[PDB]
């Protein structure tokens, strides 16, 4: 089968996910302002629902007819273990588990977001080793499995200068 | 992970080893084809074979890889240390995998008595599978991680757990 990290797709400044093969997520900061077209589809076939940060495009036909449709919910329970699937670059993949708390509007380096609010479970000062976000990862989805069942609850919205703290911005 | 690291990181019988030095290749003993005369072009006869376990080390009396720099190997790391497993995977994507490591353990996995240093994955809270965890493919992969302005090599991945959660380093 296709993994879920074929659905992270470079896009705009950062990344976004395909849900299904007409459903596409990502962070509203991250779309382009210029634009008549996305993946070779003129905007008057897009429908664009925007909810503060978080975006859906639903496209008029299958873009990606490889993919099966994956459950999409509006954040998760309070202490949910998600994984934020990050693409570099590089070519480098870093899933890294967060604990997920509540939906709240947070002061993240001097600005306020709306969303749900999470820790990064993977230590202390990360040095310079691949265990923390950086601006360039905005768009990429958290995760988790749910009996045999895969579930996507948000996009990747803004992280502190300390790391730690991460807001994962949800639809509503 | 820098560019170096990934350069050592070598296909190898049913897994991986790595390039510690110009002459020095370490592996998990059970990914070694069995029946093997001669690696690198060179007969036994001129290859020193250190095997403890689930660790081999071959030490070349001629300069495989001159490109290499020789780095740290120790024997292990503290009980704490976040290490990142250098996986690589299906079509040039890397998979830097976060654990935190534990205390040298003996396990029963399926079939086998396994003896090294424990540690819990770090991608995810059920790591089960290609996707936020190790397959048996993934046996050599290089355990590392950052001191200082040094980058040290501690261990080969050697198993994971039915769950997935739990991997064992074969060490030194
Ligand atoms: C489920 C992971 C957790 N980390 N700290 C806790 N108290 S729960």
Redesign the pocket.
């Known amino acids: 089968p296709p993994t879920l990290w074929s659905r992270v797709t470079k896009f705009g400044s950062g990344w976004g996910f395909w849900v299904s093969p007409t459903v596409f997520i990502t962070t509203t900061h991250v779309i382009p302002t210029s634009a008549k077209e996305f993946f070779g589809e003129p905007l008057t076939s897009i429908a664009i629902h925007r909810a503060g940060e978080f975006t859906l495009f639903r496209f008029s036909k299958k873009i990606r007819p490889d993919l099966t449709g994956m459950i999409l919910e509006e954040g998760c329970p309070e202490?949910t273990?998600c994984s934020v699937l990050i693409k570099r670059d590089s070519g480098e993949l870093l899933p890294l588990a967060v604990?997920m708390g509540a939906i709240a509007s947070m002061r993240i380096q001097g600005r306020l977001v709306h969303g749900q609010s999470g820790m990064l479970?993977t230590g202390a000062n990360a040095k310079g080793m691949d265990l923390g976000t950086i601006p360039g990862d905005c768009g990429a989805p958290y995760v988790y499995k749910r009996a045999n069942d895969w579930v996507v609850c948000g996009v990747h919205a803004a992280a502190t200068k300390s790391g730690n703290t991460v807001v994962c911005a949800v639809q509503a």
């Open positions: 202490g273990v604990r479970l």
